[PDB]
Symmetry: D2
Subunit: 248 residues, 4 copies
């Protein structure tokens, strides 16, 4: 079970991070929603009660994310779980002939900065916080769960920046679990296929073999709970995608 | 929840299949252990209670497999889940220079027949049974879970036959989930690393000294919780999951 | 250069294996085409001249492959390379709901026996032949090249038996290269996408670029590069124009 | 044959990039070495002769890469091949328990910026230059080859930034090949295991000397010329695309 664990969930005001937060608070854990100030984190935290607060922060900022973890530890006393769901996406070709338009450097930089350098910023700063915990009966001090994408394996036309960023998450999964193994922190990544969140904001659903529909955010939340409960899952990437494989 | 579902677990008399049956029965499901007659199957299904029975069958036998699935459908009315855990292992080099010995073809064939063809034999026969189920609210008629190994990806010296059989399992997982998509049967494969079973249990704790964290052999109850997650989560399909403590196997 | 080398190519009377044999003989190597007695192996070997012979053998047969390897080692003096291209395909659903048809166990067993058990049978018995060679200046005594398929990774509807056999090839590539490391035999597998051969001849249209079936001479070119590069080992290479298969 | 093709090779003053230049120019091609100003660039470009020039440039700069490409296009008339070998490595734990030291954010940012954003900078700006060429008999306009690493799959302890940069190169290889398919530009990535280049001084020392033993066969560090031979194979084979090839002796990295 996850009752009594404290989880910091980035991207927690919407979509997969918010559904994760609803499932873990409903199972008895406490959840901090780390999300930008312009989001609706504060209200969603209120709707989930006193065991779920909002920590406004941008994950590309060291000082903000350090302030958000300080808040979580001060309120709830420790951090057991982190879930990285903050992320953005763009759909721009590397070079579009017709328009003779190269993809800009700054649009690639921005997607790398939020998705991959923002996930590594959270990881590096929560790892020292979970390192303070007394190890449980099996030597574990924490679990860190990241969100990649099937775009890390079958990135479509227009997804070079998003793919680069999520393949970076996938490539650092095993070296960060091997770095944190001596202090008992597992590191696992989930790679969702196509899910019903805002991030889509009209024919995507038909491509999915079975179930033949977009994923429900609550199914990502149930895998997150399984990942936190299973003590031997480590250093691995799970696809959650209805058996889809993306075409160009 | 798995309360009420009927699962047939091949390899259910020992190790990972037996720990899966104990967890699923302790959570309210029914379980049929499918394992060879010599095994401890009968005893185990007795110690597990009236919601678990033993169906003697060798998975390389179409007739025996089909008889066990029919027993299950007779006793319990339907089959909702199948978990393939029957398997064998050998440690024989392709060519051993000290000995001057070449791996026999029959010792490769044997591993391939139990591990690979025997999992396909159970899959193909249980798909037609699950296809008799009424689809649930979300279109689902059944879930098939196979057990490969990390050896499908990092086979060590000595594991050509075992690696070939487990890579065959991994390679057929997506085309079988695509074949079954129209009738709502999910197909997922779990690839354990090293586990404390009557396959493993100085030769063994050297192996457990290589696991990053937790630093020890897997406990079969951890494989059984992964199998419960895979039954419960409706969107996991056509994928292979490593369950191994972050180990990568050296030669 | 592959000049001088002796290769045994299973499935060499047709498609990929024959194009590979044309290229390697054209570059000065010797080739032994290992194929079933009913194929056109004798004529194909005759057309390539006296540096190319036919050794009729089914790769599932331990007696037949040992006699064809022995013919190669006697005729040419040694075996430096083995290319596994012998292979068959089927298109059968696991369970077909409209006809209420279960895939038969025999059709799955026959594809695994030719493609997977046959490729291991050639590897296991050519290894000890190559083990007789004096190592070259970098320790090498031989190179073994197997043929899998993109179906090991994106198997389509109807390909459960073929994907199982090609996923078995990929799976065993690294342990046999580990096994053979002490005697200097490299082991590499190619996973082609779709190639214009008698196994095949809108599939073409799905390949990003170039948008067409592959040409068997491009597979032959990638085989020569794997024979020439001393550091490629224990790896599977996709040769597929960037195709990813849909159901 | 590579004869008469024009190749721009980033990181071309040393290691893999230089040995790749040496091989292509030995085989009849022209090569531009794109490397920083403080490297041996200019002297290598001289030793390699009249069909090899140095364009000093940092791959992280739009302006410098655009200028180096323009010089190649002005001086040889076209660009047929691009080879990304510019790269840096670091060995830093995400969080060090003994020393109680966290990996800095700017050290991870610097390796992602050189290795991954610097490789996409060159791709996107060379793509349009290759797109000026007329298509060959088979529809091809150019080939782009990138260098990742087996760290993209088995990153060791200390390699979080390096692995994240290299796994990002692997992750983008297919979407870029798909993006560039209409114009006939293949995109392939090579993931080298451990090679005898000057980069090697990144490992402990009590690590480095031992490396060879881990390599199954041949049981040694890779020779840079072996990397160069695989690059020529990728240039020549018209059907390789969208794929990553390990070149590593069958090694699998332990922690
Ligand atoms: N929905 C899908 O189909 C899908 C598929 C695959 C992967 N993903 C990944 O799932 C994760 C969650 O996305 P989602 O679908 O829930 O979308 P979402 O847009 O609903 O939620 C993303 C949340 O991340 C927050 N966020 C963005 N930038 C941030 C920053 N710099 N700092 C802090 N918060 C920031 C947003 O404000 C938002 O509340 C993302 O990493 C996305 O890439 C989503
Ligand atoms: N234990 C590990 O470290 C480990 C690691 C990876 C994968 N695995 C895989 O896990 C699965 C379960 O193995 P385990 O460790 O529990 O071993 P186990 O020996 O304890 O259990 C295997 C069961 O399979 C049954 N079996 C063997 N051949 C059979 C046949 N033809 N027909 C029916 N039953 C047959 C055996 O009688 C035994 O009861 C196997 O597929 C094995 O390859 C195990
Ligand atoms: N052509 C494609 O699109 C494609 C794609 C991926 C993989 N492949 C694989 O490439 C390989 C080459 O096939 P191809 O396309 O050249 O087909 P092909 O039919 O033209 O040739 C295969 C050769 O194998 C021989 N062979 C079959 N069974 C044999 C047996 N038991 N013993 C000895 N020889 C036997 C056949 O007689 C034939 O001459 C096979 O392994 C195939 O599975 C082909
Ligand atoms: N040597 C190995 O074992 C090894 C293994 C795997 C991958 N790699 C990768 O191989 C590629 C080549 O490395 P190498 O071993 O030749 O190392 P190297 O240090 O000898 O050469 C790399 C070159 O890249 C140049 N470079 C660095 N940053 C640059 C920048 N911002 N702009 C332009 N040039 C820049 C350096 O000046 C150097 O000349 C790198 O991407 C490296 O990560 C090397
Ligand atoms: C950015 C995503 C992949 C690219 C997708 C796309 C890309 C192009 C397009 O026209 C529509 C869509 C809809 C859903 C998008 C996405 C939601 C899931 C995600 O990862």
């Amino acid at each position: 079970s996850v009752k009594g664990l404290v989880a910091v969930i980035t991207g927690g005001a919407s979509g997969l991070g918010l559904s994760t937060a609803k499932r873990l608070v409903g199972q008895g854990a406490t959840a901090v929603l780390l999300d930008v100030p312009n989001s609706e984190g504060e209200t969603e935290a209120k709707k989930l009660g006193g065991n779920c607060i909002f920590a406004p922060a941008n994950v590309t900022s060291e000082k903000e994310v350090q302030a958000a973890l300080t808040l979580a530890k001060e309120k709830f006393g420790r951090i057991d779980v982190a879930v990285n769901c903050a992320g953005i996406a763009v759909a721009i070709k590397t070079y579009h002939e017709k328009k003779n338009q190269v993809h800009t450097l700054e649009d690639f930089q921005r997607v790398i900065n939020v998705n991959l350098i923002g996930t590594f910023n959270v990881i590096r700063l929560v790892a020292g916080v979970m390192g303070q915990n007394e190890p449980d009966q099996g030597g574990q001090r924490g679990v860190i769960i990241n969100t990649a994408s099937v775009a890390a394996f079958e990135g479509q036309v227009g997804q070079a920046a998003y793919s680069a960023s999520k393949g970076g998450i996938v490539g650092m999964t095993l070296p960060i679990a091997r770095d944190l193994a001596p202090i008992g922190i597992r590191v696992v990544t989930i790679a969702p296929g196509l899910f019903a969140t805002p991030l889509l904001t009209n024919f995507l659903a038909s491509q999915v073999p079975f179930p033949s529909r977009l994923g429900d955010p609550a199914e990502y939340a149930h895998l997150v709970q399984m990942v936190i409960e299973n003590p031997f899952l480590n250093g691995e990437v799970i696809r959650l995608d209805g058996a889809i494989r993306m075409q160009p």
